[PDB]
Design a protein around this ligand. Structure first.
Ligand code: JSG
Ligand code: PTY
Ligand code: PTY
Ligand code: DGA
Lengths: 390, 618, 42, 88
């Protein structure tokens, strides 16, 4: 039931899962335009631009092939990506939902059987950090919006290591469980102008404050057959989530085409817990560079329906921020998507395919090639309509 | 053989030829089918058919008549000239009912959808008949609306509702199958009670009649529970708006039931006495699709040898006083069995008074007090398992000498005695203190043709104001299986997660050596996400059958510290649902579990599963 | 027409969703209705 | 359901002429139009405002010293005040 299979999820708080809704994830996270039917969870100011109530749900089916200097393996994971609700309230906008901050998952087996007296290990990990958010956006101007949100982080990360010698039948199983909880605040703004005829200049700025995460660790060692487990004293460690600054800018004509770029930078953080402390692994600042956009042939078309589908594409280069064996781990990928609008309604079905490469095989590291297929549902309906003619 | 060709419409001033052609949906070159043509023009089999006639009659054209005429027939190709007689628009002028000998007019006139001064509509007449039949005081086969004083020139029509009274009293004999077990209810109901004339003994024929108030004395039972209740409901509280006021007094005896093995131990049971009052009214703001529900209830639980799971005070009693408020918005339509559009959002919150704040009692130090330590209440000196004297009034402790185990006197050193868990739990749960929040979101949309997509997301949270007191052992969530409605009065909720057995995903006791390992204690948190694709094969009033495909994922958690909303048990499958008015809702589903059941040694998929239910087991 | 199923409207009484069970089964088998149908079939 | 009350009352004051309940029917007809005008679509608010004035005049013409004169006078104040917004 894990969300990831990458061994790199062991370090830090796990692999960053949420990267935007399918409508924006298919554009490499570029959300410069102030949409009226889609939710831009990463920027609270977008909540004010909503025109109708929006209900979003998304899921993905990931396929990855882990490669190392020894061999290669294939892994597949299926998960639920998000659940968000947007409600337009006059000039204000309110949004609340649940998104996965990070995920921990890996199933490594070191088979040393067939040789008496050889220890076999079965490393496994599960859990992650989830986020609950509540944001409010306000339209300071018809095309200028500002907003803020509060996010509560909560989750449990459990790491289990079972070792069994070839001869004996009773092995040991050490398990580490950490419960994390904390809150953070985000601020954002979006400004849209008109540079040329029918061409607009979209700008968006978002800032996330640093947050403190409280982790309650519990480490216990169990041996097969023995009914009394050996438990270590409980410990409490403090983690610091780094601050994020997302800058976006793009040019394009609304409902016709859009081209934009986004730059995301993270500050200093402390994601090293008691169980993931290593000497060959360090940390650096996260930095993401992405270019994406969309193209709609003819939104108001009555002859062909394929012209009304929003075609999205994007490129992305991310510096995860961890240096393993003196090698910076970076992720490079391309994304493609399409938004099919249900006839007669603003609701649409989003489909996207993302493929890329994370890590490298050099310095005895692991390289991951992934091809993820995602589906998203965006439902829109107009509420709060008063009925006259008393 | 004959082929259709050159279909034209005459006399269609309101609707253009292009709009009608789409409604008819007959193209040139198709085989000549007389039945198909008449069905598309005027579907007499059903009153809600999508025909051209219904298009005109539903918009005030009472005198509309559509008749097809074959113009030419050459080269095996037949040509039709659909003739439409629109006629003048008509409005409702006088609406009166006749035949009500025992029912007041205000009760019937308030349920008529054909308001005077509105354009004639066949849907309103059909809806009015349905609403009049829902009352139950009249004959379902004699609700005949008769048109009177029809004035085509003036464009006004008068409707007279001829009703046949058949007695307000009714007998209820219903049955259903949910949660893997049959459930039946039997009761007598008086749907035309009048509380105004309660003290008036002059009019007491089979209870005072008049207002549309309803009083019912029903009995519901299953394998593990039996409940007797008396309920009073006021459909229109205040007389101005359809505000529902309901009260109920019930007594239930719930036995200990193991949903896994479907076995009931009749020796362990508890009795619940509940009194509830509720007020529900449709809100006008923010919109007319919002409904506010409020309720106040008082319950008294009487445990009788109920020593199971987290219930250590098997011979005590608990009292629950809670207030529940719920906001719901529903705009679904049009058929409740097979919705094609709309959504339903519901948020509820049940809260109890915060007794822990005002009463100065330390629930954490209860186990370290003399009053909560095991003691010998006898008055005769006895001998413990250790072979030593146990004088009356001395504290005791449990010691295992050789194979057998027993109590051993500790003297007056209460600090070394065993804490009485039964007394501590009783003090902690003497007055239930908790808060329950439930969130549900259901959305319906048409993808292509008759196929509709349904998205369902449910959340449930149970907690306590003081962590030292602990979460109450009642009002818990059980996930997995076919699911069952909230028939029990203890707050237990059974959630359906196809592809897995009943209550198979509920957290279990993992203490191993607690003497109760493997027992299902209940979950405090639960979240289910489901997606379905349904296709209707028949949507008639006699029988509504539709097929469905689903993709579900859900999980239950014991505490908030273990809440992982994205660690779910996934499943997939297909099912068939049939609804008949006499036989109720029947459903058969086949789901495949992609995950292993909790507590399983091997991480292997659960596999295929079969679920059968009767009724709305939500 | 009486057997047709319709959603609640502005003129229909509001349903209380925050109360315990009423000892009734929604959309369940109605034996009284079955008995009435059998009589008509005789 | 003020829209249906106007039609129902119009027929009653016509099908049963010379009745002691006419005074009450006249007032309720005015109230039905008053509530329908004060809360109605702004497109046809003027039409309903005029109907309210007509109903008020009929009530006063029937019995000048009507029992509902105090309430009727107050209702007409709102109609006249709101009518000034449409004084094109
Ligand atoms: C808004 C909407 C509505 C919601 C409303 C909620 C918001 C309001 C605020 C609520 C918070 C209130 C908390 C509270 O307070 O009230 C609590 C009650 C609250 C009631 C609320 C009612 C709500 C009503 C709702 C109505 C609805 C209509 C109870 C409590 O209190 O429980 C506390 C528990 N918290 C919970 O349970 C909450 C629960 C949550 C429950 C509520 C969930 C509600 C959700 C439902 C809503 C859903 C709606 C849809 O969380 C969880 O379930 C998980 C998370 C939940 C996930 C939610 C998911 C949502 C999903 C939604 C999906 C849609 C807490 O955990 C920590 C966290 O708490 C919350 O978060 P978390 O829990 O982490 O999650 C905070 N805050 C939060 O907001 C989190 C909220 O969830 C957030 C809400 C989220 C809402 C989401 C909304 C969604 C809907 C919206 C949609 C849009 C977090 O802040 C944070 O970071 C987080 C953040 O920033 C805060 C702000 C966040 C706000 C969010 C904004 C909103 C945003 C929303 C949108 C984004 C914070 O990190 O642990 C405490 C334990 O502390 C004590 C104790 O109990 O006394 C004292 C400790 O000492 C301290 C100290 O003193 O300082 C503590 C630290 O400071 C630290 O420094 C520490 C050092 O490390 C020590 O080394 O020291 C220590 O003991 C030591 O202290 C003494 C001292 O001197 C120190 O030296 C020593 O004395 P001495 O030596 O003499 O000097 C003692 O030793 C003596 O004694 C010992 C024995 O002898 C004695 O014997 C026994 O007795 C002892 C007694 O003490 C026992 O009584 C035992 O303790 C002993 O162990 C022992 O067994 C011997 O020991 P030994 O040596 O032998 O070992 C020893 O020898 C010697 O004798 C001992 O050593 C400890 C012991 O170790 C445990 O064993 O025990 C508990 O007590 P507390 O102290 O009072 O806090
Ligand atoms: C979650 C539990 C807490 C819920 C609390 C409910 C709050 C009650 C609000 C009562 C309504 C406000 C009072 C004034 C009503 C008159 C209308 C004017 C108000 C207003 O400006 O907003 C209108 C619509 O929003 C409104 O009228 C306000 C919207 C209220 C919030 C909507 C969401 C409620 C919670 C349900 C969501 C969760 C699902 C469960 C059902 C838009 O008016 P306009 O178009 O003229 O624009 C205004 C520009 N001039
Ligand atoms: C938080 C739970 C624990 C604490 C308990 C909270 C108790 C809340 C207060 C009690 C509820 C009664 C008061 C609100 C209802 C009165 C409204 C009268 C009916 C009505 O027509 O509604 C209009 C606005 O309604 C409205 O009032 C719209 C808003 C109604 C919903 C707001 C209540 C909370 C909803 C969320 C519940 C779930 C919580 C989840 C955490 C007011 O019109 P008018 O009467 O002036 O006439 C003018 C037009 N008719
Ligand atoms: C490996 O052994 C195999 C499992 O083998 C089996 O035993 C077969 C399992 C049973 C197959 C299904 C039987 C029922 C037929 C109907 C299927 C349901 C279709 C529903 C479509 C419409 C929605 C209602 O393993 C597999 O077969 C692997 C399965 C991987 C599936 C990956 C694709 C799932 C979709 C990804 C997105 C997540 C879904 C939610 C989308 C909305 C977002 C909220």
């Amino acid at each position: 039931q894990q969300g990831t299979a990458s061994p790199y999820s062991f370090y830090g708080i796990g692999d960053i899962k949420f990267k935007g809704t399918l409508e924006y994830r298919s554009m490499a996270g570029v959300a410069v335009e102030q949409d009226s039917i889609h939710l831009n969870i990463e920027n609270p100011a977008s909540y004010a631009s909503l025109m109708q109530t929006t209900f979003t749900v998304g899921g993905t089916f990931g396929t990855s092939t882990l490669k190392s200097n020894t061999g290669s393996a294939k892994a597949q994971r299926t998960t639920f990506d998000y659940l968000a609700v947007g409600i337009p309230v006059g000039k204000f906008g309110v949004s609340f939902g649940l998104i996965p901050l990070s995920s921990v998952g890996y199933k490594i087996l070191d088979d040393n059987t067939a040789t008496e007296g050889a220890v076999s290990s079965q490393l496994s990990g599960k859990g992650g950090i989830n986020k609950v958010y509540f944001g409010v956006g306000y339209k300071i101007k018809p095309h200028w919006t500002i907003g803020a949100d509060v996010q509560y982080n909560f989750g449990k990360i459990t790491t289990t290591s079972i070792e069994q010698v070839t001869g004996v039948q009773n092995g040991t199983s050490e398990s580490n469980a950490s419960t994390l909880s904390g809150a953070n605040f985000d601020l954002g703004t979006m400004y849209q102008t008109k540079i040329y005829k029918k061409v607009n200049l979209f700008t968006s700025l978002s800032y996330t404050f640093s947050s403190n995460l409280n982790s309650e660790n519990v480490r216990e060692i169990n041996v097969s057959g023995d009914p009394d487990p050996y438990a270590y004293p409980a410990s409490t460690t403090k983690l610091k989530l780094p601050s994020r600054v997302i800058i976006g800018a793009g040019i394009g004509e609304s409902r016709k085409w859009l081209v934009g770029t986004t730059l995301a930078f993270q500050g200093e953080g402390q994601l090293t817990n008691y169980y993931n402390a290593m000497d060959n692994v360090r940390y650096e600042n996260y930095a993401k560079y992405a270019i994406g956009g969309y193209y709609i042939p003819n939104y108001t078309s009555f002859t062909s329906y394929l012209s009304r589908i929003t075609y999205r594409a994007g490129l992305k280069y991310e510096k995860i921020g961890l240096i393993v064996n003196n090698e910076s781990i970076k992720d490079v990928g391309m994304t493609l998507g399409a938004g099919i609008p249900i006839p007669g309604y603003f609701s649409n079905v989003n489909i996207g395919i993302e493929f890329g490469k994370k890590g490298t095989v050099s310095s005895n590291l692991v390289q991951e090639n992934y091809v993820n297929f995602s589906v998203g549902f965006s439902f829109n309906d107009k509420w709060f309509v008063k009925s006259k003619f008393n | 053989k004959y082929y259709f060709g050159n279909i034209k419409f005459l006399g269609n001033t309101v609707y253009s030829d292009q709009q009608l052609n789409r409604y008819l949906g007959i193209k040139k070159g198709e085989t000549y089918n007389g039945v198909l043509l008449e069905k598309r023009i005027a579907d007499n089999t059903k009153p809600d058919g999508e025909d051209i006639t219904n298009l005109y009659q539903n918009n005030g054209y009472l005198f509309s008549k559509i008749n097809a005429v074959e113009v030419k027939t050459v080269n095996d190709t037949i040509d039709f000239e659909i003739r439409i007689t629109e006629g003048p628009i008509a409005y409702f002028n006088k609406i009166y009912v006749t035949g009500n000998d025992k029912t007041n007019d205000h009760v019937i006139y308030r349920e008529l959808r054909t308001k005077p001064g509105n354009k004639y509509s066949k849907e309103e007449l059909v809806r009015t008949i349905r609403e009049i039949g829902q009352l139950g005081f009249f004959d379902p086969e004699s609700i005949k609306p008769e048109f009177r004083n029809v004035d085509p020139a003036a464009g006004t029509v008068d409707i007279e509702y001829q009703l046949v009274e058949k007695g307000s009293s009714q007998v209820e004999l219903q049955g259903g199958y949910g949660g893997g077990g049959f459930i039946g209810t039997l009761g007598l109901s008086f749907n035309n009670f009048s509380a105004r004339k309660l003290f008036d003994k002059d009019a007491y024929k089979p209870l005072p009649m008049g207002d549309g108030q309803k009083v019912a004395l029903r009995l519901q039972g299953s394998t593990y529970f039996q409940t007797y209740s008396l309920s009073f409901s006021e459909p229109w509280f205040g007389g101005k708006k359809p505000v529902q006021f309901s009260s109920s007094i019930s007594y239930s005896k719930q036995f200990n039931y193991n949903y896994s093995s479907r076995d009931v131990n009749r020796n362990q049971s508890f009795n619940i006495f509940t009194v509830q009052v509720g007020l529900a009214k449709r809100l006008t703001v923010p919109d007319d699709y919002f409904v506010l529900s409020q309720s106040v209830s008082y319950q008294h639980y009487d445990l009788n040898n109920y020593y199971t799971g987290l219930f250590t005070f098997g011979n005590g009693a608990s009292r629950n006083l809670a207030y529940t408020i719920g906001l719901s918005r529903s705009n679904k339509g049009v058929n409740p069995i097979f919705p094609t559009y709309g959504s339903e959002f519901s948020i509820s919150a049940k809260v109890t008074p915060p007794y822990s704040l005002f009463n100065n009692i330390n629930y954490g130090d209860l186990q370290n007090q003399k009053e909560y330590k095991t003691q010998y209440t006898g008055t005769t000196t006895t001998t413990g398992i250790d072979g030593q004297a146990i004088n009356p009034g001395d504290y005791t402790k449990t010691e295992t000498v050789n194979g057998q185990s027993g109590t051993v006197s500790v003297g007056s050193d209460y600090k070394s005695a065993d804490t009485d868990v039964g007394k501590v739990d009783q003090k902690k749960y003497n007055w239930l203190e908790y808060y329950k929040v439930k969130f549900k979101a259901d959305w319906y949309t048409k993808i292509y043709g008759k196929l509709v997509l349904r998205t369902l997301t449910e959340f449930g949270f149970l907690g306590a104001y003081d962590q030292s007191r602990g979460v109450v052992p009642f009002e818990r969530f059980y996930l997995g299986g076919d699911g069952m409605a909230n028939y029990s009065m203890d707050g237990r909720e059974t959630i359906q997660l196809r592809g897995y057995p009943n209550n198979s995903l509920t957290p279990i006791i993992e203490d191993r050596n607690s003497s109760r390992y493997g027992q299902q204690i209940g979950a405090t948190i639960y979240n289910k996400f489901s997606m379905e694709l349904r296709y209707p094969i028949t949507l008639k009033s006699s029988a509504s059958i539709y097929a469905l495909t689903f993709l579900e994922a859900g999980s239950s958690y014991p505490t908030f510290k273990d809440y992982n909303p994205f660690d779910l048990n996934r499943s997939a499958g297909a099912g068939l649902r049939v609804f008949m008015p006499a036989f109720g809702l029947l459903g058969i589903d086949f789901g495949y579990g992609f995950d292993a059941l909790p507590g399983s040694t091997t991480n292997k998929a659960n596999g295929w599963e079969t679920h059968f239910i009767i009724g709305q087991q939500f | 027409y009486v057997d047709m199923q319709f959603e609640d409207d502005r003129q229909s009484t509001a349903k209380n969703t925050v109360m315990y069970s009423d000892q009734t089964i929604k959309y369940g088998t109605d034996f009284v209705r079955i008995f009435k149908d059998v009589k008509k079939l005789l | 359901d003020y829209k249906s009350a106007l039609v129902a009352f119009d027929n009653f004051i016509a099908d049963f002429p010379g009745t002691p309940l006419k005074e009450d029917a006249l007032f309720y007809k005015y109230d039905s139009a008053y509530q329908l005008a004060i809360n109605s679509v702004p497109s046809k608010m003027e039409e309903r405002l005029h109907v309210a004035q007509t109903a008020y005049a009929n009530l006063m013409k029937y019995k000048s010293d009507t029992k509902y004169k105090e309430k009727a006078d107050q209702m007409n104040a709102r109609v006249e005040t709101d009518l000034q917004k449409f004084t094109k």
